[PDB]
Amino acid sequence: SRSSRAGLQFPVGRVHRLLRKGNYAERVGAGAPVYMAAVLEYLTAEILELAGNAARDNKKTRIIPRHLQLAIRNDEELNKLLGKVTIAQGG
Template sequence: MFHLPMSARQSPVKMALVAVPAPFPRDIFHRPIPSPSPRQFFANHRLSLASSTSHPRPRILPIQAASTSSQARARSFAVGQVARFLKTGRYAQRVGSDAPVYLFAVLEYLSAEVLELARNAARRTGSYRGTSTWL
């Protein structure tokens, strides 16, 4: 029979739990980098009406801070919203990534033309504001 000394029998044995970290994944540098979907890409970019007047093709500009004025905000459309409406509206089985950009450019051009005609009509009458009859 195995006998322990008296001091070892009277003191309770204390066990410590030690957290062992998980091993480092060695394939972290070999994993493919996921590219953003068109919805994620276009949700973070906008085309502005001001860009179409100075350049022949509209430019994709990153969204800036929320300090834009309401007038400038009213003149810009989100490409991501156009892409979402095309996909949820069931206009086709599949929607390419270039389709919302092209449709957005057409809508931007048409809205710029209508606003220019309304501005010209307001200038002819000598007023500073356009009414809904000119639109």
């Protein structure tokens, strides 16, 4: 479908449905879901690549909230982006 056709791994259809039912505009284009899905995929991949390195630093496979807190508060851009976010049980 759109998810595979855009070279992605996120639900383009679900993002479009959330945009349409979210009352973000009277109408929603046909490229906004594809753009949003790619942005979210990139952000999630960045965080899961930093948290993966943080966890492998402690020689641990499963990623726990502390690993995510360490990655977010270590990387500068993610720190200022989520500068008002409480990563529960993160430290």
